[PDB]
Amino acid sequence: MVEIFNEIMQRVKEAETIIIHRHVRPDPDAYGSQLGLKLYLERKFPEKNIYATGEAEPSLSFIGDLDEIDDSVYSDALVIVCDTANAPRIDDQRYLNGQSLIKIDHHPATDQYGDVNFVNTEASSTSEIIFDFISHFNDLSIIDEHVARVLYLGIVGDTGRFLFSNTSPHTMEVASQLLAYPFNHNAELNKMSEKDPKLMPFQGYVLQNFELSDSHEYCQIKITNDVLKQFDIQPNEASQFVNTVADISGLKIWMFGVDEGDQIRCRIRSKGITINDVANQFGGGGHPNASGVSVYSWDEFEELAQALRQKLLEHH
Amino acid sequence: MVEIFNEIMQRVKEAETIIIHRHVRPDPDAYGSQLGLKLYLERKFPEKNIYATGEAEPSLSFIGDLDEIDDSVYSDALVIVCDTANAPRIDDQRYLNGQSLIKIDHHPATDQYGDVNFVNTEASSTSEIIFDFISHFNDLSIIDEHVARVLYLGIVGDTGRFLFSNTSPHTMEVASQLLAYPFNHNAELNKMSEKDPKLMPFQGYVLQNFELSDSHEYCQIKITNDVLKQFDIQPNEASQFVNTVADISGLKIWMFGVDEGDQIRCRIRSKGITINDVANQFGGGGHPNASGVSVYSWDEFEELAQALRQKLLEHH
């Protein structure tokens, strides 16, 4: 065929039970897109058995709970790996133990795992692809407040509340359409934006210990083992406050290094400049806009700063 | 008539020069709605003279600059007080010195100043009303990247990036339509989200000095004159960090009190509970969700806390 959506819905109508998967570390989209496809199907073919397997992140518990698959249901069922770049990165690994495999994602097509592959690279999120799918079957009536909830939240998180560049006029329109359904976005949004007061004091530290260039283009934060225990926080926890300096006016590149003990795992992100470049120089790597390195000392951490800062000289 | 939009466009076509106004303390909407109506008109009747008067807030300088009216142009011209609850709160006061007055706003109609009054109470923002207006004249083609810019930014700020409850599915749709025009929202958005690193250290203090109830429902911050000079910041500046604790999980009501010297001007905001109530008890007042009081001591500040906290006992 040429209209993959139809071939999917077909494979679906011909299976009494289908289970959906998503990548490992879950995000609002990976959550909404999964629970969404599910909630949708369950509304269209109540005679079938739709399940969503996953580790279940308590962080997204409010979006919806997952299902406990008995691994023997994979016998004669259709597996749908929703939102997942590469297969190994799929959550439950018994997905390949189904009748046929079908994947829906919005990341660059490099794996193409699964029989039928539909990747709308230009989509803001998989949730969005799901809305497109159900919208292609005029089921915008069969859907309700429960389904739209996840789909919204999904698009919301994957685009940071329609802020990121991946937000298109269509994305808005879809968001527009979901809000039609009664569910109160303001509420849902807040419960998603909640924060732990426990970590707030530390975050204040980050704000009190900067490191901006005279030009404001470069900014760093050294989290010494001392502060890690002074504020009583694990190296992991503190490492989530990277973008706590991103909003500084004029900031072009910033690095956040927290000492784990025998190495200083530093996460480096830039406004929009090839950075993973220098990352490799130090044995690191990653996306050109958000890479990571694991120096063995602050003296080396500084060499990284010097290398990063020099990158700003080529641009002006 | 019954279709105010037409009566406006009429009064417009019959005036070689029209000037637009907005309320005093400007906001992104009041800015976008003004510059927007203007930029629009200037595209429709280049033969006329459209001007936008205002004090000009350097904060919104990037949205667009205002015009310097010679007060004698008001001779035979149409004045359009865009986005402004009450007349006294209008910026340039020589507005009443025009041929006829016409106002467009989205706040409750309590003033009704001006000949023709159009208030879409259910609109997310005046900018949105402007899009509606131009959209009613099929001028979505005459408009360009420059006009949509302000209108977007306007809706954006007035709804905090489609987060507030005033965000409707139509609001999204309008946002959707504006993005069609080439202007890059991501960029524009950031320049609007920029922050001053100068105040960041202090903000860290606020995060390091909370005051949450055992239930997390109540939170306060006492900004003593000491810290006001320890971090070298004016009482005004520090007072803008009220909602710096709003995202705490479970927070229902919070107060932020900063000592100005001979009085402690405290701004009190709640999640969604009638609060201006207690405000009056202390000689204050304001909206039920964001009021203000000016106690003469921290001992009194505490009485306010007690009164506010007791308000949480009636609800559960």
Ligand SMILES: [Mg+2]
């Ligand atoms: Mg995704």
Ligand SMILES: [Mg+2]
């Ligand atoms: Mg407004």
